[PDB]
Structures are given as C-alpha cells and as structure tokens.
C-alpha cells in the first residue's frame, strides 16, 4: 500500500503518450470517432 498498484485507464493513456517517451509528438488522435447528431439535412 506504500505506492500506487495500477489503473485500468493507463492502457488508454499509454497508446497516446506512455511513461517512456512523448509519443504525442508523432501520434494523431482521430477525434472524428465521436457520435454524430440525431439528424441532418442529407
């Protein structure tokens, strides 16, 4: 209990920017993946 064991969300952080390097300088998050509007003109 003297230190933090783990965190389930760290796998989602690591693929963007891990503890080892600033991977965010070369990575590109596809934010467009979010849910669309309930309707559009189409």
């Amino acid at each position: 209990s003297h230190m933090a064991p783990e965190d389930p969300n760290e796998e989602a952080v690591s693929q963007i920017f891990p503890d080892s390097v600033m991977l965010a300088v070369q990575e590109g998050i596809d934010l467009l993946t979010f849910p669309p509007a309930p309707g559009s003109p189409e």
């Binding site: 965190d7 969300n9 760290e10 952080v13 920017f17 600033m22 998050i29 596809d30 934010l31």
Partner: protein
C-alpha cells in the same frame, strides 16, 4: 461499431485529464496521473502550441474538446474545458 475502441480510449484518458487537473500532489504515483503530467507540463509552457502547429498540445486539446462537448460545469477543474465551452457557443 469500429469507433467503439477509439471512443473508449478517448473517454478513459479524459478521466486521467480530470484527475491530473485536481490532484493535490505533483509527485502522485498513479500511472495515469504520471503520464498525464508530461503533456500537461508541455502545453502550459510550449512556445509554439496549437497556435504554431505543435502536435503534442493538439493531442491534449483534442481530449479537452471531447470533454467540454459533453461537460456543463461553469468552474470545471480542467483549464481548457471552460475555454472550449465558451468557443462552442460562438459556433451556434
């Protein structure tokens, strides 16, 4: 639904964003907080940032945008959140 894995990765990292923006100790041993601290310390001091085209700052702000899109707290601990909330109102 191939968007599920990416959407889940975004919202999972956003819990780490909220944590690191309210965390009472800069030395926190929580793996997610430790990882977040690097990008947080970068964007607050980057002489280029999103204004000059810096990719790091953009990756952080993309998650701040996803957060702010769904958020509504007028005093949210995330610094970028409130700015994005105000910017979204200009798009209407």
């Amino acid at each position: 639904s191939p968007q599920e894995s990416r959407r889940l990765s975004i919202q999972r990292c956003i819990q780490s964003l909220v944590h690191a923006c309210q965390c009472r100790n800069a030395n926190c041993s929580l793996p997610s907080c430790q990882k977040m601290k690097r990008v947080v310390q970068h964007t607050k001091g980057c002489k280029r940032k999103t204004n000059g085209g810096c990719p790091v700052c953009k990756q952080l702000i993309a998650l701040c945008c996803y957060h702010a899109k769904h958020c509504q707290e007028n005093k949210c601990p995330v610094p970028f959140c409130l700015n994005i909330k105000h910017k979204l109102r200009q798009q209407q």
